[PDB]
Amino acid sequence: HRAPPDKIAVIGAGIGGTSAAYYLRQKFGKDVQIDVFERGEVGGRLATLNVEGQEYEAGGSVIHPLNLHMKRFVKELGLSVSQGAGGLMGIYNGETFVFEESSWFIINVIKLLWHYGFQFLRMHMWVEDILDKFMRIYRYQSHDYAFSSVEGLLHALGGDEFTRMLNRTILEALQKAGFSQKFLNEIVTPAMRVNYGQSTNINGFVGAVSLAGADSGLWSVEGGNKLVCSGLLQASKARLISGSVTSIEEKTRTKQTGGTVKLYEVTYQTDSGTASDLYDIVVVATPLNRKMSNITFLNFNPPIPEFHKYYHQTVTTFVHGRLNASFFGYKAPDSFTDILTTDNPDLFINSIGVVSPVKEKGSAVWKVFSQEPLTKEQLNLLFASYDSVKEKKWLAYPHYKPPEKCPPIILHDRMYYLNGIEWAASAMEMSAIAAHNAALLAYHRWYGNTEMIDQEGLYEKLKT
Ligand SMILES: Cc1cc2nc3c(=O)[nH]c(=O)nc-3n(C[C@H](O)[C@H](O)[C@H](O)COP(=O)(O)OP(=O)(O)OC[C@H]3O[C@@H](n4cnc5c(N)ncnc54)[C@H](O)[C@@H]3O)c2cc1C
């Protein structure tokens, strides 16, 4: 038994930050002060963007059914789900379509059998086994077990298989599993491009998450994914502070009872000028690039270990206007919503797809993933006409460079960093798992419940 903490800072009003605030509240009780910093708008990558009067998801867009944190949250917050359908889908290689979906599902079955055989089925079954192991996390989190390291977490779910996938490229992985060069370049690679704007040179684990994201049932939050952030924030009853955190420094206190412990001074800038406050615990729920969150770490002993890592640029470009169906090879096209690309370096886009707005109400609204800002020439070559154009540059996810070691969860004595998780998978639910885990870990670390940390073979014992 020990003194419960007075103040906790959470840096970042992301889905990660606000999820932390929520779970912290659940572990430390109503008493503890929780402050969430946000230099920008709540939601971070779950922003929207106004296009001819309506809001569209510009960052985090869809949510899988096995995203239980987001499911439980939308339920608890009483938000509505925009579980819509989609449309038609094709893969372009820079000459023609290696594959196009038909209106008859049986046609599609036939096409995919001829072109790929059972590889469609076999990937499914390989992915299910990965997912199935991964779902163990919920049971462990519902029983409050924590993990000090993204690797250790994965190990606890899938054992060595999962830690080896992290160090493998999803290409290596699927070749070792006997998937064909054809299927890898025609199916798998486009999926990587659309999802993570990178090729099959990304973490096997990320990649398998990616491939479940072609599973069906998908949905989004009606009104914006970013509502989930503000909704949790409210429901956690944390104090939201608009300011760009600049610096974080250890100090020593003096508990009335002659204490001598280590606090963290967080300095942040606002309109008015500089301001600061002292915290017993810190959770960083933003990436630690100097381009993404300029926090300086002062007088630490020992120094925070190396989270130095780089994210990948993806530009979401929205266009109200009609496509150039002839730029993909149609001439007189009888009658055609999403185009994915193969890894052809003559292409300048990752994907291009008609979108619906967040609210629920040709020449329509399109969404273009590109590595770089689209030039006038490329917009013109892309669309016949366009009334309006909107574009956000998004350090969106890691530049997965396997083999590599995920950034720590523990930066210091009582300072935790959840965005390490991205290097296993960048997704909404992944931020939620990390936040949950980060909260548990901090709690167990504060109260010294070492029986609850880094416990292996949990699933067996927890299994009936
Ligand atoms: C283009 C795109 C598409 C995506 N599509 C999907 C998808 O289809 N499905 C899915 O599940 N996920 C998707 N994601 C991921 C989704 O956005 C998740 O939210 C993501 O894993 C975490 O992003 P975040 O900013 O919400 O969280 P975090 O990165 O954990 O939160 C970062 C927060 O910290 C704040 N911050 C930064 N610096 C400071 C500072 N100095 N002081 C205070 N606050 C600071 C930021 O403003 C932000 O709010 C997508 C992301 C992008 C960019």
Residue with tokens 């994914």: 225
Determine the longest span between alpha carbons in the chain, in angstroms. 84
Residue (of 330, 291, 344, 341) closest to 313 by Cα position: 291
CA-proximal residue: ligand 1, atom 35 (nearest): 12
**Beta carbons of 108 and 89 less than 8 angstroms apart:** no
- Which amino acid would we find at residue 195? N
Distance 420 CA to ligand 1 centre (A): 13
CA-based end-to-end distance of the chain: 32
Nearest CA to ligand 1 atom 49: 44
Q: What is the DSSP letter of 26?
A: H
40 in contact with ligand 1, CB cutoff 6 A? yes
Q: 33, exposed or middle or buried, with CB in 10 Å at 0-12, 13-18, 19+? A: middle
Ligand 1 centre distance from Cα of residue 286 (Å): 8
Q: How far apart are CA 57 and CA 197, in angstroms?
A: 17
Q: Quick one: which of 217, 203, 237, 171 has its CA closest to 29?
A: 237
| Calpha distance 47→242 (Å, rounded) | 16
- Work out whether strand 97-100 and strand 89-92 pair parallel, antiparallel, or are unpaired: antiparallel
Tokens describing residue 71: 């499911």
Using CB atoms within 10 Å of the CB of residue 209, give its burial: 0 to 12 exposed, 13 to 18 middle, 19+ buried: buried
Q: For ligand 1, is residue 314 a contact (CB within 6 Å)?
A: yes
Residues, the chain: 464
Substitution site in 426, 429, 430, 433 for ligand 1 pocket (most atoms within 8 Å of beta carbon) = 426
3-state secondary structure of 2: coil
Q: Does residue 137 contact residue 157 with C-beta atoms inside 8 Å? A: yes
Laid out side by side, the sheet with 244-252 consists of: 273-279, 262-270, 244-252, 296-298
Q: Which of 219, 220, 221, 199 is nearest to 210 (CA)?
A: 199
Helices 15-28 and 428-447, interaxial angle, to 10°?
Answer: 30
**Is 46's C-beta closer than 6 angstroms to any atom of ligand 1?**
yes
Q: Are 221 and 48 in contact (CB under 8 A)?
A: no
* Under 8 Å between Cβ of 42 and 233: yes
Measured torsion, CA atoms of residues 197, 406, 394, 80, in degrees rounded to the nearest 10: 90
**How many whole angstroms separate alpha carbon 237 and alpha carbon 436?**
17
Handedness of CA 113, 115, 117, 120 (dihedral sign): negative
- In whole angstroms, give the CA distance from residue 115 to residue 111: 6
Q: Which residue bears the tokens 């002060």? A: 33
Final resolution, Å: 3.1
Count other C-beta atoms under 10 Å from residue 280's C-beta: 22
Ligand 1 centroid from CA 282, angstroms: 18
The b-or-e profile of 282-300 (16+ CB within 10 A means b, else e) is bbbbbbbeeeebebebeeb
Residue nearest atom 6 of ligand 1, based on CA coordinates: 60
363 CA from centroid of ligand 1 (Å): 30
Say how far apart CA 8 and CA 438 lie, in whole Å. Answer: 13
Strand partners, 340: 91, 351
User: What is the Cα–Cα distance from 203 to 35, expressed in whole angstroms?
Assistant: 34
Question: Do residues 341 and 94 touch, judged by C-beta distance below 8 A?
Answer: yes
Q: Is the dihedral of CA 83, 79, 70, 292 positive or negative?
A: positive
Q: Are 352 and 367 spatial neighbours (Cβ–Cβ below 8 Å)?
A: yes
Question: Residue 180 burial by CB count (10 A; 0-12/13-18/19+): exposed, middle or buried?
Answer: middle
At residue 46, what is the residue type? L
Residue 282 tokens read as 């810190």
CB of 370 within 6 A of ligand 1: the answer is no
DSSP string, 424-441: T--SHHHHHHHHHHHHHH
Distance 434 CA to ligand 1 centre (A): 13
For CA atoms 108, 112, 113, 115, give the dihedral sign: positive
Contact between residue 355 and residue 367 where contact means Cβ atoms under 8 Å apart: yes
Sequential DSSP letters for 304-345: PP-----EEEEEEEEEEEEE-GGGGS-SS-----EEEE-S-T
* Residue type at position 421: I
DSSP β-bridge partners for residue 281: 8
| Tokens of residue 18, six digits | 């606000």
Angle, vertex CA 271, rays to CA 266 and CA 272, nearest 5: 80
> How far apart, in whole angstroms, are the C-alpha atoms of residue 430 and residue 424?
8
Residues 6+ apart with CB under 8 A from 385: 321, 322, 363
Q: Distance from the CA of 57 to the center of ligand 1, in angstroms?
A: 12
Residue 303 CB neighbour total at 10 angstroms? 10
Tokens 């994907």: give the residue: 351
Residue nearest atom 27 in ligand 1 by C-alpha distance: 14
What kind of experiment solved this structure?
Answer: X-ray
Residue nearest to atom 23 of ligand 1 (CA): 45
**SS3 at position 138:** helix
Q: Which tokens sit at 376? A: 């006038």
**Cβ atoms < 10 Å from Cβ of 264:** 23
Considering only CA atoms, which residue is closest to atom 32 of ligand 1?
286
d(CA 9, CA 168): 36
The residues pairing with 238 across neighbouring beta strands, listed in sequence order, are none
d(CA 416, CA 247): 15
Type of residue found at 211: L
Return all residues near 220 (Cβ < 8 A) that are at least 6 apart: 57, 61, 62, 63, 81, 82, 83, 84, 358
Sheet of 410-412, strand order: 239-242, 33-38, 7-11, 281-284, 415-417, 410-412
Helical residues (DSSP H) of 179-314, grouped into ranges: 181-183, 189-196, 204-212, 226-236
6 SS3 class:
coil
Query: What 3-state class would DSSP assign to 394?
Result: strand
Strand partners, 259: none
Alpha helices in 78-179, H assignment, sequence order: 105-116, 119-134, 136-142, 150-158, 160-167, 170-176
38 lines ligand 1 (CB under 6 A): yes
